[PDB]
Amino acid sequence: EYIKLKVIGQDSSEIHFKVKMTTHLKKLKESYCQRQGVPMNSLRFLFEGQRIADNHTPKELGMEEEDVIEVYQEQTGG
Amino acid sequence: LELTEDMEKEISNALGHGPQDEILSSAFKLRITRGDIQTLKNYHWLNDEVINFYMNLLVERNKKQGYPALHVFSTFFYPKLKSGGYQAVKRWTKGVNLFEQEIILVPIHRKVHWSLVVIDLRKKCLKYLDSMGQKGHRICEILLQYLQDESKTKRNSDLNLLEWTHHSMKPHEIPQQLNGSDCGMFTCKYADYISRDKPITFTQHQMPLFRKKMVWEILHQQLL
């Protein structure tokens, strides 16, 4: 566990996470998903406008301490 | 009869029953699942996964075809900008120079319906298209404003706002949707055509086939 991130959501709902730069972010998502009780696929995580893939990594994206990972909800329109 | 008997099957399978979460196409850091592709079923509302993905295939198409340098914003861009101003999206275009582009596509998610805004750097102009005949009055302003900031911010220099203009395509200028579900397809096709400097000549009537064609185009990350 090297970095501490802030996973903020559209309604301002924050949630801190201590993660291993060595690891995939999928894990961070799964936990955010349940810690919220929201189906995986209904959410989208972005870092500075860039969508965070599953096998993506803190080191890869180059996230400094206390960086924000923004969460967005599925959109639809008619 | 322009859709191959085989392709038909392929398109059929993607849309048929199967695990919703099953991934069917990966690219641009996106994983299109059977659940997403579903949004392309008739009368179905398209979702961001489909659009953002299509929006990307367009850039690649333009790139390998020699059409204008196309840059595309995420469906999440405008909304975020709208709420948090320039600061919220400032680092969204870090690895790139917007003004070196030629055509900028900005998908617009208004409550319950998709719309599109085209920025043509070549002609210093913002164009708002909407298949449900809406107005992009404010929307265009916010975006132009965005440009003023990005320019002054990223290349330290104002934009000559005098040489810039923004028209809102009126109902009699572009094809309008006839059923309440295709705004997404329209946004997508408007983009497709505009990015090629091709005059929009399609109608609501083609949208059904377009829908099918899209799923194929997606599975093979190759536009037809």
Swiss-Prot record, chain A:
UniProt-annotated site: Interaction with PIAS2, residues: 17
Per UniProt, location of the Glycyl lysine isopeptide (Gly-Lys) (interchain with K-? in acceptor proteins) cross-link in this chain: 78
GO cellular component: cytosol; glutamatergic synapse; nuclear body; nuclear membrane; nuclear pore; nuclear speck; nuclear stress granule; nucleolus
Effect of residue 78 to A: Abolishes sumoylation of ZBED1
Organism encoding this protein: Homo sapiens
Stretches assigned to coiled coil: none
Residue stretches making up the Ubiquitin-like domain: 1-78
GO MF assignments: enzyme binding; potassium channel regulator activity; protein tag activity; RNA binding; small protein activating enzyme binding; transcription factor binding; transporter activator activity; ubiquitin protein ligase binding
GO biological process entries: cellular response to cadmium ion; cellular response to heat; DNA repair; negative regulation of action potential; negative regulation of delayed rectifier potassium channel activity; negative regulation of DNA binding; negative regulation of DNA-binding transcription factor activity; negative regulation of DNA-templated transcription
Sequence similarity: Belongs to the ubiquitin family. SUMO subfamily.
Compartments in which it is found: Nucleus membrane; Nucleus speckle; Cytoplasm; Nucleus, PML body
Cleaved signal peptide residues: none
Disease as annotated in the protein's UniProt record: Non-syndromic orofacial cleft 10: A birth defect consisting of cleft lips with or without cleft palate. Cleft lips are associated with cleft palate in two-third of cases. A cleft lip can occur on one or both sides and range in severity from a simple notch in the upper lip to a complete opening in the lip extending into the floor of the nostril and involving the upper gum.
Post-translational modification: Cleavage of precursor form by SENP1 or SENP2 is necessary for function.
Residues with Phosphoserine modification: 13
Superkingdom field: Eukaryota
The protein's role, per its UniProt record: Ubiquitin-like protein that can be covalently attached to proteins as a monomer or a lysine-linked polymer. Covalent attachment via an isopeptide bond to its substrates requires prior activation by the E1 complex SAE1-SAE2 and linkage to the E2 enzyme UBE2I, and can be promoted by E3 ligases such as PIAS1-4, RANBP2 or CBX4. This post-translational modification on lysine residues of proteins plays a crucial role in a number of cellular processes such as nuclear transport, DNA replication and repair, mitosis and signal transduction.
Subunit structure as annotated in this protein's UniProt entry: Covalently attached to KCNB1; UBE2I increases cross-linking with KCNB1 and PIAS1 decreases cross-links with KCNB1. Interacts with SAE2, RANBP2, PIAS1 and PIAS2. Interacts with PRKN. Covalently attached to a number of proteins such as IKFZ1, PML, RANGAP1, HIPK2, SP100, p53, p73-alpha, MDM2, JUN, DNMT3B and TDG. Also interacts with HIF1A, HIPK2, HIPK3, CHD3, EXOSC9, RAD51 and RAD52. Interacts with USP25 (via ts SIM domain); the interaction weakly sumoylates USP25. Interacts with SIMC1, CASP8AP2, RNF111 and SOBP (via SIM domains). Interacts with BHLHE40/DEC1. Interacts with RWDD3.
Position(s), cross-link Glycyl lysine isopeptide (Lys-Gly) (interchain with G-Cter in SUMO1): 6
Protein name (record): Small ubiquitin-related modifier 1
Record region ((Microbial infection) Interaction with Tula hantavirus): 1-6, 18-21
Location in chain, cross-link Glycyl lysine isopeptide (Lys-Gly) (interchain with G-Cter in SUMO2): 4, 18, 20, 26-27
From Swiss-Prot, chain B:
Active site per database record: 113, 130, 183
Function: Protease that catalyzes two essential functions in the SUMO pathway. The first is the hydrolysis of an alpha-linked peptide bond at the C-terminal end of the small ubiquitin-like modifier (SUMO) propeptides, SUMO1, SUMO2 and SUMO3 leading to the mature form of the proteins. The second is the deconjugation of SUMO1, SUMO2 and SUMO3 from targeted proteins, by cleaving an epsilon-linked peptide bond between the C-terminal glycine of the mature SUMO and the lysine epsilon-amino group of the target protein. May down-regulate CTNNB1 levels and thereby modulate the Wnt pathway.
Effect the entry attributes to changing residue 183 to S: Does not desumoylate CEBPB
Protein name: Sentrin-specific protease 2
Organism listed in the record: Homo sapiens
Keywords assigned by UniProt, alphabetized: Cytoplasm, Hydrolase, Membrane, mRNA transport, Nuclear pore complex, Nucleus, Phosphoprotein, Protease, Protein transport, Thiol protease, Translocation, Transport, Ubl conjugation, Ubl conjugation pathway, Wnt signaling pathway
GO cellular component: cytosol; nuclear membrane; nuclear pore; nucleoplasm; nucleus; PML body
Gene encoding the protein: SENP2
Family the entry assigns: Belongs to the peptidase C48 family.
UniProt PTM comment: Polyubiquitinated; which leads to proteasomal degradation.
Region called Protease, residue ranges: 31-195
Subunit details: Binds to SUMO2 and SUMO3. Interacts with the C-terminal domain of NUP153 via its N-terminus. Interacts with MTA1.
Domain-related comment: The N-terminus is necessary and sufficient for nuclear envelope targeting.
GO terms classed as biological process: fat cell differentiation; heart development; labyrinthine layer development; mRNA transport; negative regulation of protein ubiquitination; positive regulation of protein ubiquitination; positive regulation of transcription by RNA polymerase II; protein destabilization
